[PDB]
Amino acid sequence: RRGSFVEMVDNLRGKSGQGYYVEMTVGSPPQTLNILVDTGSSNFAVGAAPHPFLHRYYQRQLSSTYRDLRKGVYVPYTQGAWAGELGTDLVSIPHGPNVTVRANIAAITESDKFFINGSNWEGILGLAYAEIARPDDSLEPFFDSLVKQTHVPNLFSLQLCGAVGGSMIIGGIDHSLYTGSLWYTPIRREWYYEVIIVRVEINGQDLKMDCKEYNYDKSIVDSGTTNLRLPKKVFEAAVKSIKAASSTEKFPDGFWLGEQLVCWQAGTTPWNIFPVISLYLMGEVTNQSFRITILPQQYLRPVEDVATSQDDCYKFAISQSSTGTVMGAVIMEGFYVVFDRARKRIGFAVSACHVHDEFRTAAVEGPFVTLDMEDCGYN
């Protein structure tokens, strides 16, 4: 007994805190590359010249189907940037849908703080909308091309399994990847995958901030960001509340700032002393919301520790932002997330693979009643 999308299950790999990547095959004859999956941008780009952190790269002169667009392109990220040259070529995903498309591809020739020593990936796949593509919104993103050229339904889903692997189901949903029900939140606007957060609780206790603060100046779902990032005022109140909740134990100020690690002897981490965190999201019906809840297993990330060692070290993976809330891997690793582009909504369900213990599990629950949710969005 196996689902229809079985061949797409377990098609993602990664190293903790270094993103998740899928194999993609480009050009003719085939050149296969590992590509980071990033719902927080809209450019498909691949290393195309030697670099000290690259084991392989795209060789355009060897691809008979490569077409030069005669146009440079530059993409800056929160951290990192690259410059390159636009072209098109044939692209397939071996463990994805059974189609081949002609896609825009940025050949990366120069970069700064983009590639990572020993990450195993060589490019990036921007899965968000045309509005944020560089150089402009006329450069059709990969997923747009896929839907326009083929029968593949305008939907994909992600199950990121923390410690690294997971699944990207393209064109559908695999029911073995989650338990319980899927709850949907509207995509507020098609640029980033923007959503509306209406309330935050720490161990069941409301942070009690104006919901406008949670979404100043946007809230997005972003698989290419490790952390849960919060606007400054929200970050400060959250840290205050998490500290109060974990007060049976003391940690230095720098731990909460991500500047200091704390390590426990292997297999002794007191998960139970840290609180759970809940975000409520706008639902699909007027005045209705639902909440997703994550565990410290999601927001305290282990730092390898690759070789067998006596010490489990952790970094606090909630951090501050000047560009709104980013629901990164810290959030996504608890859940199966459905990017339902066709119906302009994002679904969440408890992930079948999320890391938890015998006393607590990540959760998705509803419905709740929340009034005036429309006012929460930044304009």
Binding site: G40, S41, P76, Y77, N227
Partner: peptide, 8 residues
Amino acid sequence: XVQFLAXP
């Protein structure tokens, strides 16, 4: 960690 798009 990674920190993927900025408005610069």
